[PDB]
């Protein structure tokens, strides 16, 4: 029976051998591969309000420059936001460990209660395995903590960080009288510049504009009211470099117009401190997201490896090498292996 238990447990969790349950379930410790593909869900269940991130970044800069005037964005304004974001993932990692322990306990029960008719033996062989599993819970959790603590200890920008925003088609409705009609073109808006293309290959680069020092307005109803229209206009110079009647631009819906306006606002444009600090805040926000993508990626990869090394493999080694030695130590060896009435 001890031989049969050890063999049955190994088959069920590794998936080796024949007589597999092709029809009834997705089960028998293959559920753990779902946790390893469910933990990637908990890491994105978390959410934050960007306005709190912006407020927190702003106070971080002002608190780093104590009295001094700021020339360049301080590095600690990056580091102290990343540390604060990383501390948040302590909880889901511990939830993952607890779910895995739960499945191991359930699998041990199936391999024990259902296959053994001797009383008392199915208690010793369940008690011992679940005691051993609980001790490994302890060691596994310490190692997870000493991994997150390491993610905080140093900021590494060498491998895949952003090493030193909106796209779509727009049609110009007001063409100069020497051409007439309307011109449909590919528009790319970044946080820095505007670029006009003839197609989505983005090869022509026919027009380039700065995002700064421009203004947005709505338009009066002097047109055939079939499209929603905004205007990008300049008050510092008489022309928007290459001008088309203050670059009136039509969209299919007002929501598209509002999304465009929001994209301009994100790029640094103001609605119809501010000069310096807002640019610094946007730079930090983007850098923080690019680095957190790397942190999340590394955590998803190492957590299942940590659990396999520390919890699963030691359990199998215990079952094969120690289990019999412990059963001889339980009770008095007189009531163990006593037949039930059935």
């Amino acid at each position: 029976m001890v031989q049969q238990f050890a063999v049955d447990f190994e088959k069920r969790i590794e998936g080796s051998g024949d007589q597999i349950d092709t029809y009834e379930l997705s089960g028998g410790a293959r559920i753990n591969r779902i946790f390893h593909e469910r933990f990637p869900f908990e890491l994105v269940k978390m959410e934050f309000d960007e306005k709190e991130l912006r407020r927190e970044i702003s106070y971080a800069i002002k608190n780093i420059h104590g009295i001094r005037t700021g020339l360049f964005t301080p590095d600690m304004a990056f580091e102290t936001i990343v540390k604060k974001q990383v501390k948040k993932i302590r909880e889901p990692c511990l939830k993952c460990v607890d779910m895995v322990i739960s499945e191991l306990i359930s699998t041990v029960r199936q391999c024990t209660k259902k296959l053994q008719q001797y009383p008392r033996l199915r208690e010793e062989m369940e008690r011992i395995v679940t005691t051993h599993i609980r001790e490994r819970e302890g060691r596994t959790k310490e190692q997870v903590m000493l991994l997150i603590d390491i993610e905080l200890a140093y900021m590494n920008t060498n491998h895949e960080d952003f090493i030193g925003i909106r796209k779509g088609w727009l049609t110009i409705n007001n063409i100069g009288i020497m051409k007439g009609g309307s011109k449909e073109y590919w528009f790319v808006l970044t946080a820095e510049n505007l670029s006009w293309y003839k197609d989505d290959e983005e090869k022509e680069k026919k027009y380039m504009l700065s995002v700064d020092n421009l203004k947005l307005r709505d338009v009066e109803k002097g047109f055939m009211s079939s499209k929603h229209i905004f205007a990008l206009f300049n008050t510092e110079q008489r022309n928007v470099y290459k001008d088309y009647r203050q670059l009136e631009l039509a969209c299919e819906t007002q929501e598209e117009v509002d999304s465009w306006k929001a994209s301009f606002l994100r790029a640094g444009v103001y609605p119809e401190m501010d000069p310096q600090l807002e640019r610094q805040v946007e730079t930090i926000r983007n850098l923080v997201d690019s680095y957190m993508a790397i942190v999340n990626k590394t955590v998803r990869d190492l957590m299942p490896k940590t659990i396999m090394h520390l919890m699963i493999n030691n359990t199998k080694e215990f079952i094969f090498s120690e289990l019999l030695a412990n059963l001889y130590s339980c009770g008095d060896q007189n009531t163990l292996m006593e037949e039930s009435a059935e």
């Binding site: 001890v2 031989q3 090498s321 019999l324 030695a325 001889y328």
Partner: protein
């Protein structure tokens, strides 16, 4: 004084070597120290293994 400082500075290296050797051996001496010729359980465990 320098000879004394040198001889003391190497103690941490010797301590780690001895500690490593005990950890490697401990797993097996734990069982060998409990050997008794009259032990049918030891024989049975070896048979199963």
């Amino acid at each position: 004084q320098q000879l004394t400082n040198h001889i003391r500075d190497t103690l941490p290296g010797l301590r780690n070597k001895l500690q490593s050797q005990l950890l490697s051996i401990e797993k097996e001496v734990e069982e060998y120290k409990n050997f008794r010729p009259d032990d049918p359980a030891r024989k049975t465990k070896a048979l199963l293994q």
